[PDB]
Design a protein around this ligand. Structure first.
Ligand SMILES: [Zn+2]
Lengths: 58, 97
């Protein structure tokens, strides 16, 4: 782009895939395993809503 | 080796324990009649037998807890025990990871 006589290039930014189910785990936390899904309409109607399914440590 | 302790039913003990028989304590060698081969052991058992011969209305809040089932629950449900339960499980979680 040419903004105010300056050539500007937009750099790609990496992001976790949306609408995909991830299962992570923290070695020091109260959740043993956490399932994550950054859901979002295919047409970007609204900012993504993150839903978490977890598992309390005994 | 066998315990060979003289039971009240007249039969010798057939329990196969390496060191200690729960119903008779320490295990000592015995003959076919269940008599300790060591004379010292016979004397000790005789001393043990002599020692054995020598031997409001409602339940209060402390008295209610005074029983069997409550005592085992107190030990199981303890702040240190639960933490030790978690701490022990944390160590296998490290092994699992
Ligand atoms: Zn025995």
């Amino acid at each position: 782009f040419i903004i105010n006589g300056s050539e500007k290039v937009l750099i790609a930014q990496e992001k976790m895939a949306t609408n995909t189910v991830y299962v992570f785990a923290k070695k020091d936390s109260k959740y043993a395993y956490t399932g994550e899904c950054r859901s979002c309409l295919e047409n970007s109607s609204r900012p993504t809503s993150t839903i978490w399914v977890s598992m309390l440590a005994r | 080796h066998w315990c060979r302790a003289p039971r009240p039913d007249g039969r010798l003990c057939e329990r196969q324990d390496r060191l200690k028989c729960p119903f008779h304590g320490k295990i000592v060698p015995r003959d076919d009649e269940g008599r300790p081969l060591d004379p010292e052991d016979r004397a000790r058992e005789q001393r043990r037998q002599l020692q054995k011969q020598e031997r409001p209305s409602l339940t209060n809040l402390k008295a209610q807890a005074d029983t069997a089932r409550a005592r085992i629950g107190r030990k199981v449900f303890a702040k240190a025990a639960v933490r030790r339960v978690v701490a022990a499980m944390n160590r296998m979680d490290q092994k699992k990871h």
